[PDB]
Amino acid sequence: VLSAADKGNVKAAWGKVGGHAAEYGAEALERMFLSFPTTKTYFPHFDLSHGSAQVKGHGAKVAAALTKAVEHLDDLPGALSELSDLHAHKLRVDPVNFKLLSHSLLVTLASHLPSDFTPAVHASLDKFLANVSTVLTSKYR
Template sequence: RDLEEAPCFSTHPLPPARFFVNFPSAKQYFSQFRHMEDPLEMERSPQLRKHACRVMGALNTVVENLHDPDKVSSVLALVGKAHALKHKVEPVYFKILSGVILEVIAEEFANDFPPETQKAWAKLRGLIYSHVTAAYKEVGWVQQVPNSTT
């Protein structure tokens, strides 16, 4: 199924909108919604919704393939390398975004998110971050230093 056609987030909050509201420095990586300040405008942004669907699609692929460590490694390596080489996103944003996603899941599905489920998701979050940062290291990632005006 094409992620761009998937009706993800049609009735649920958009975790990336909260991510950008709570961590506005992350918007620097997205020219198409860098200028947005209003959370409602972010929620309605077709570009942000499209990116959110890609993020959640990748997360879904990881969850559906937890039985296949090679597939999980492959997916997360592709994501990590693309974000290191093409998008030049600091890897810490993966940890931050995954935390925001877990917050939204916990709020939206509070009755179906007992402590043992929360623990499993926290473990998955660590797994994702370790695979992504390994991909960054593999491509020789060097932390980006903001341009200074001298």
Template sequence: VHWEDAEKQYIVSVFSKIDVDHVGANTLERVLIVFPWTKRYFNSFGDLSSPGAIKHNNKVSAHGRKVLAAIIECTRHFGNIKGHLANLSHLHSEKLHVDPHNFRVLGQCLRIELAAALGFKEFTPERNAYFQKFMDVISHSLGREYH
């Protein structure tokens, strides 16, 4: 994947402009609420029976922060995101058996949360496209272990 300097610079800069903990938690909450079939991967998280239960679930919030931290770490590896995520790809495919489509769902939800956090004047359609490209690369990289 070829990255333009403007793409990389903007993606990196976004994470200094948002409350990472809040956006990370909200992203995973949105995934679980809007795409309820994704809850099957989080049986150990306790009560996920309603949007309210999901929003008040500390394990969901903590895991959302962890996921976003892993996404942010990818900004240090633009030249080799696939290699950087190889171990996570293996874990999600071989041990957790996560449907790779869910990685795209996560990317969609993250872009919605970023748009909400940054506003339309900051998160323009062009910049949204930068993040779609970034999340598509991450999704593809996480799904590479699947047959």
């Protein structure tokens, strides 16, 4: 569960990301697919080539949902309900993959934000992503 400090760190860090959210979304996915190739089995219909238009278009969607989550930190189950149906009911994504993507995203943000990615921001973002992951893996209808 997120403290008031966590929430402020998440909003502040995501605010710094800003317009680069889409790019970092795609790079996170690309880093996940490269480092953890079993995650690719969730996307057999995709072309997963480097620089793939599908991967990049899809990273924009993930980033947008994260933005939505950042704006609704007090009701993540409510805001992310449709994406829970998708990831938990339909796709049945193993929660380990959420840790893999979360880590890939932290790697991405760290590399692009050396000054803003402080130990405290890192902690808060890790908790936030854990929270999103829990919601997306939960059947709560």
